[PDB]
Amino acid sequence: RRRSRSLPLPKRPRRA
Amino acid sequence: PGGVITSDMIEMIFSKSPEQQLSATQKFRKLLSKEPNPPIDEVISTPGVVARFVEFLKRKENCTLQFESAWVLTNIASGNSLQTRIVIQAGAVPIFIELLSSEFEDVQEQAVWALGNIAGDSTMCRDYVLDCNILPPLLQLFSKQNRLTMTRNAVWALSNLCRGKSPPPEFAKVSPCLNVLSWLLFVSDTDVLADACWALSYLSDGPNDKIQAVIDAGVCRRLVELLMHNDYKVVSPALRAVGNIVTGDDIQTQVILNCSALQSLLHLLSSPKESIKKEACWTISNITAGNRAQIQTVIDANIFPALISILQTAEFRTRKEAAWAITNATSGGSAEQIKYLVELGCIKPLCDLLTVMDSKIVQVALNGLENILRLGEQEAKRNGTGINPYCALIEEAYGLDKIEFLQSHENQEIYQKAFDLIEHYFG
Numbered sequence: 324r325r326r327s328r329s330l331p332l333p334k335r336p337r338r339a
Numbered sequence: 340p341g342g343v344i345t346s347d348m349i350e351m352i353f354s355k356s357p358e359q360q361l362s363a364t365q366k367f368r369k370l371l372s373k374e375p376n377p378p379i380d381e382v383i384s385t386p387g388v389v390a391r392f393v394e395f396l397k398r399k400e401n402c403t404l405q406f407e408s409a410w411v412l413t414n415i416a417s418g419n420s421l422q423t424r425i426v427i428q429a430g431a432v433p434i435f436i437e438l439l440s441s442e443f444e445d446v447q448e449q450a451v452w453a454l455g456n457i458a459g460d461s462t463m464c465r466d467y468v469l470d471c472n473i474l475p476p477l478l479q480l481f482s483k484q485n486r487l488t489m490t491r492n493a494v495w496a497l498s499n500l501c502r503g504k505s506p507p508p509e510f511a512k513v514s515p516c517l518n519v520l521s522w523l524l525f526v527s528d529t530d531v532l533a534d535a536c537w538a539l540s541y542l543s544d545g546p547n548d549k550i551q552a553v554i555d556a557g558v559c560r561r562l563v564e565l566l567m568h569n570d571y572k573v574v575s576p577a578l579r580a581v582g583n584i585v586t587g588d589d590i591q592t593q594v595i596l597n598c599s600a601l602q603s604l605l606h607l608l609s610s611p612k613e614s615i616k617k618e619a620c621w622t623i624s625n626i627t628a629g630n631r632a633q634i635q636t637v638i639d640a641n642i643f644p645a646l647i648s649i650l651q652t653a654e655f656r657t658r659k660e661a662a663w664a665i666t667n668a669t670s671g672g673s674a675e676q677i678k679y680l681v682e683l684g685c686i687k688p689l690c691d692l693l694t695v696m697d698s699k700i701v702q703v704a705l706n707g708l709e710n711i712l713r714l715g716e717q718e719a720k721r722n723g724t725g726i727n728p729y730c731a732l733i734e735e736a737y738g739l740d741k742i743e744f745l746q747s748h749e750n751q752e753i754y755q756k757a758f759d760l761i762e763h764y765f766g
Contacts, residue, residue: 324628324663325586326621327614327656328579331537333459333499336417337410337452338372 344370344381352391357401364395364407371414379415379422389415393429396450402443409438409449416456423460432457432471439476448489451480455496462503469500469512481519484526491530494523498538510549513542517556524561529570536565536576543583550587554594559584563598571612578607578615582622589629596626596633601640608645613654620649620660628667634676637668643683650688659700662692666707677714681729686711690738698750705742705756708733712764730764739765 344367345351351363371377382388395401395408412435416426431453438450454477458468473496480493497520501513516538523535539562543553558580565577581600585592607619623646627637637643649661665685669677685707692704715729733739745757 324625324667327617330502333502334417334456335452335495336371336377336414337449338374 341381344378344385349385349388352388357404360395361401361404361407364392364404364411367392368407368411368414371411377414379418382411382415383422383425389425390429393426393431393434396431396434396438399441402446405438405441405443405446406449409435409446409453413449413453413456416453416460420460423457423464426453427457427464427467432468436471436473436476439473439480444486444489447480448492451477451489451492451496455492455499458496459499459502462505465500465503466508466512469508473500474512474515478516478519481523487528487531490523490526491528491534494520494531494534494538498534498541501538501541503541504544507545510545510552514552517542517552521556521558521561524558524565529572532565532568533570533572533576536562536573536580540576540579540583543580547587547591550584550591553580553584554587554591559594560598563595563600563603566600566603566607571615574607574615575618578618578622582618582625585622585625589633592626592629592633596636601626601637601642605640605642605645608642608649613657616649616653617657617660620646620657620664624660624664624667627664628671631671631673631676634668634672638676638679643668643680643685647683647685647688650692655695655697658692659697662689662700662703662707665689666703666710669707669710672710674714674717677711681711681732686729686732686738687736690733690736690741693738693741693745698753701745701748701750701753702756705745705753705760708738708742709756709760712760716764727764 348363348366351359354360367382371379371382392408392411395404398404412426412431416423435450435454438446441447454468454473458465477493477497480489497516500508520535520539523531526532539553539558543550562577562580565573566581568574568577581595585595604619604623607615610616623637623642627634646661646664650658650665665680669680689704689707692700695701711729712727715727719725719727742757742760746754748754
């Protein structure tokens with residue numbers, strides 16, 4: 324047997 | 340509007356002068372640093388402006404300008420696919436890759452950032468970036484263990500390369516990172532450990548030979564030990580990775596069990612965090628779908644009273660997984676083993692499931708009750724008495740009522756099962 328299960332948002336902006 | 344980006348910014352960006360080029364670039368960079376909504380669309384909409392930044396990456400004599408430009412492109416390459424495609428179409432990728440090798444640290448860093456954004460945009464962007472040979476010079480970057488921000492960026496970008504099941508990357512294009520990855524597990528930084536577990540979970544998320552490959556880089560022990568980490572950031576992805584590895588055959592799962600994972604999984608079954616308990620339940624269900632000895636190792640870790648308590652007390656997402664964990668054990672267990680489950684009181688919690696909406700769970704619960712009735716039938720003949728010990732016990736938990744009620748359930752297999760069981764085990 325295998326498989327909610329979600330992930331981090333894939334993109335990241337550089338802030339500041 | 341339009342003109343919410345300077346007329347002078349275009350003028351400076353396009354000038355002869357390095358000072359003005361940078362000055363404008365900085366304005367761009369700060370405007371794209373804006374938290375609420377940065378002007379991605381406006382920037383993309385002045386038509387030679389992206390390309391200019393991409394050309395500024397080529398200015399090997401200028402650290403600042405290369406850096407600010409990579410920053411600008413990093414941000415355009417954040418959020419959506421259509422704005423990202425502009426950065427790709429101006430050929431920024433081979434340049435950023437070549438910039439992985441710059442003598443400048445800041446540039447090296449920002450470039451890995453931008454490449455992480457681009458790879459994280461889609462499946463085909465991911466493969467497109469692999470195809471441009473990002474790996475060797477990316478992997479090369481971990482060889483300086485001194486600087487932290489760079490290492491974070493890199494593992495981060497790296498997990499973007501491994502991510503995505505539709506289609507998965509070409510494994511051979513991505514499996515060279517297993518070495519670096521296995522040993523980044525012993526590093527100390529939370530973010531670095533987290534991403535290396537993400538990456539390792541994406542790589543373990545497939546067929547048994549891909550799992551094998553993850554097993555052969557020897558991360559299992561670190562991975563099981565990271566189940567005890569104090570920061571959720573590390574525990575979730577580690578839990579996924581261990582969770583993924585135990586989807587393999589019995590041998591592969593044994594490797595996890597040989598690291599004493601169960602004792603840590605038991606702990607996790609009390610997490611404040613529901614997704615953790617849920618994930619730990621699911622991981623367990625895949626261990627109790629193994630051979631008699633694995634089931635028995637789950638018994639001896641004392642896992643089962645926690646599963647039962649979960650079935651009684653938790654969210655339906657969580658309880659689904661506990662329920663599978665318990666029924667799988669009834670399916671692959673010895674008689675002594677199921678007797679142990681009954682003696683623990685697993686009968687009522689299965690019978691309570693019988694009246695929920697999700698039809699599969701009902702099936703799961705019926706499957707487990709069948710298994711138990713079957714052993715009890717097998718017992719009435721070994722000993723003298725022709726009475727099933729588990730009939731009276733299932734009745735007493737109002738299980739008998741639920742099963743008859745289930746004869747008028749709409750689902751075909753449900754009503755059938757309920758019917759055959761009444762007929763086979765009840766009078």
